[PDB]
Design an enzyme around this catalytic site. Structure first.
Site, short mmCIF file in Angstrom:
data_model
loop_
_atom_site.label_atom_id
_atom_site.label_comp_id
_atom_site.label_asym_id
_atom_site.label_seq_id
_atom_site.Cartn_x
_atom_site.Cartn_y
_atom_site.Cartn_z
N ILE A 15 0.81 -1.22 0.00
CA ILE A 15 0.00 0.00 0.00
C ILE A 15 0.85 1.28 0.00
O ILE A 15 0.31 2.37 -0.15
CB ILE A 15 -1.05 0.01 1.14
N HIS A 17 5.22 2.80 -0.75
CA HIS A 17 6.59 2.47 -1.11
C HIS A 17 7.36 3.77 -1.32
O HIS A 17 7.01 4.59 -2.16
CB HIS A 17 6.60 1.53 -2.32
N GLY A 18 8.36 3.97 -0.46
CA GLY A 18 9.26 5.11 -0.58
C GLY A 18 10.69 4.59 -0.58
O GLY A 18 10.90 3.38 -0.46
N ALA A 19 11.65 5.52 -0.69
CA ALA A 19 13.06 5.16 -0.65
C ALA A 19 13.40 4.49 0.68
O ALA A 19 14.31 3.65 0.72
CB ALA A 19 13.90 6.39 -0.88
N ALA A 21 11.02 3.17 3.16
CA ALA A 21 10.04 2.30 3.80
C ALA A 21 9.16 1.62 2.76
O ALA A 21 8.91 2.15 1.68
CB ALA A 21 9.20 3.07 4.79
N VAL A 22 8.70 0.41 3.11
CA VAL A 22 7.66 -0.26 2.35
C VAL A 22 6.51 -0.52 3.32
O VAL A 22 6.74 -0.89 4.47
CB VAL A 22 8.19 -1.55 1.67
N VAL A 23 5.26 -0.29 2.87
CA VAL A 23 4.10 -0.33 3.75
C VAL A 23 3.09 -1.34 3.22
O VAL A 23 2.72 -1.30 2.04
CB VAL A 23 3.44 1.04 3.96
N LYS A 39 4.58 -0.69 8.44
CA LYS A 39 5.69 0.00 7.79
C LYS A 39 7.00 -0.74 8.08
O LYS A 39 7.37 -0.93 9.24
CB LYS A 39 5.73 1.45 8.29
N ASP A 131 9.60 17.21 5.75
CA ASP A 131 9.44 16.41 4.55
C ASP A 131 7.96 16.35 4.14
O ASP A 131 7.49 15.31 3.67
CB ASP A 131 10.08 15.03 4.75
C1 LIG Z 1 5.34 4.87 1.62
C2 LIG Z 1 5.93 5.58 2.83
C3 LIG Z 1 7.28 6.20 2.46
C4 LIG Z 1 4.98 6.62 3.49
C5 LIG Z 1 4.74 7.87 2.65
N1 LIG Z 1 3.70 6.04 3.88
C6 LIG Z 1 3.52 5.88 5.23
O1 LIG Z 1 4.37 6.23 6.06
C7 LIG Z 1 2.23 5.32 5.71
C8 LIG Z 1 2.07 5.27 7.11
C9 LIG Z 1 0.89 4.79 7.70
C10 LIG Z 1 -0.15 4.36 6.85
N2 LIG Z 1 -1.40 3.86 7.15
N3 LIG Z 1 -1.99 3.58 5.99
N4 LIG Z 1 -1.14 3.93 4.99
C11 LIG Z 1 0.04 4.42 5.47
C12 LIG Z 1 1.20 4.89 4.85
#
Ligand SMILES: CC(C)[C@@H](C)NC(=O)c1ccc2nn[nH]c2c1
Ligand SMILES: [Cl-]
Ligand SMILES: [Cl-]
Length: 267
Positions: A15, A17-19, A21-23, A39, A131
């Site tokens: 759900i 995906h960043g540099a 973390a993957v969620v 996360k 950020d």
């Molecule tokens: C992808 C990551 C780099 C970031 C941007 N996403 C989250 O930290 C995040 C955190 C809690 C959540 N609860 N539902 N969705 C969520 C996404």
């Protein structure tokens, strides 16, 4: 199925995906109808990811607000770290803007009121997020906004998306919470117009642009309402001394419902 304490998740349910973390969507192992987000470390950037998720644990322990993603549980291991968080079922603002192209001023007001509430708590605690960008403004279904991604937060080495970063940050100067206000201004501008207010061919070119131009004025469409125009001009001041402070932002007339009285919803 992977587990973190009393929570479980499948990596099929990706759900976010960043540099760093993957969620994944997950659930309580005893109460299967309780949804969570898990996360995890991004192993492509292991060291930094580990550092950032550690920092995020420490920050979110102190931050509890209806418009900040809640932290339910966490586990810190040798080569991995896990945060069990509030599930936001409506994606992020980046997805929403891609889909909608632009938002009505009323929608912008609704989201910005919520952002402002979260930011009020940050301000009181002396925390700067550093950020803020559409990717970490999460939506949940009446659309609720929740600020996520607190790994870079500091009490009064940053990388992310320079187009959302304040001139003083890009120019390696002193900054405070007013740097987040710039970011908010850029996000609001993007919701209004579909584009960021200031763009360049590269991060270095953006720095050169900010260095050269001591007065930055975003191009605000003629049709924009007077309160929103005023708010955007005040948030998007190049020199932080001239930029709206938190008090003025929080109490700005734009953050009051317009129209003030409308129709009850269709039956
Ligand atoms: C992808 C990551 C780099 C970031 C941007 N996403 C989250 O930290 C995040 C955190 C809690 C959540 N609860 N539902 N969705 C969520 C996404
Ligand atoms: Cl780059
Ligand atoms: Cl560059």
């Amino acid at each position: 199925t992977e587990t973190v304490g009393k929570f479980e998740f499948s990596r099929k349910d990706l759900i976010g995906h960043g540099a760093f973390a993957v969620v994944f969507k997950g659930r309580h192992r005893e109460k299967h109808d309780l949804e969570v987000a898990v996360k995890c470390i991004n192993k492509k950037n292991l060291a930094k990811s580990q550092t950032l998720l550690g920092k995020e644990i420490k920050i979110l322990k102190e931050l509890k607000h209806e418009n900040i993603v809640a932290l339910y549980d966490f586990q810190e291991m040798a080569n991995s770290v896990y945060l069990v968080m509030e599930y936001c079922n409506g994606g992020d603002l980046a997805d929403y803007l891609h889909a909608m192209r632009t938002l009505s001023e009323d929608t912008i007001r609704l989201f910005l009121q919520q952002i402002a509430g979260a930011m009020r708590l940050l301000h009181s605690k002396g925390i700067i997020h550093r950020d803020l960008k559409p990717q970490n403004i999460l939506l949940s279904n009446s659309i609720r906004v929740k600020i996520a991604d607190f790994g870079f937060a500091r009490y009064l080495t940053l990388c992310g998306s320079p187009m959302y970063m304040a001139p003083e940050v890009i120019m390696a100067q002193h900054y405070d919470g007013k740097a987040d206000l710039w970011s908010i201004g850029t996000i609001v501008y993007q919701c209004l117009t579909g584009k960021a207010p200031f763009q360049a061919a590269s991060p270095q070119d953006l720095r050169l642009f900010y260095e050269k131009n001591k007065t930055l004025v975003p191009t605000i469409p003629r049709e924009t309402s007077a309160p929103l125009r005023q708010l955007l001009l005040a948030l998007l001041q190049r020199n932080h001394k001239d930029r709206m402070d938190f008090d003025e932002f929080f109490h700005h007339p734009f953050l009051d419902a317009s129209p003030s009285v409308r129709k009850s919803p269709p039956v």
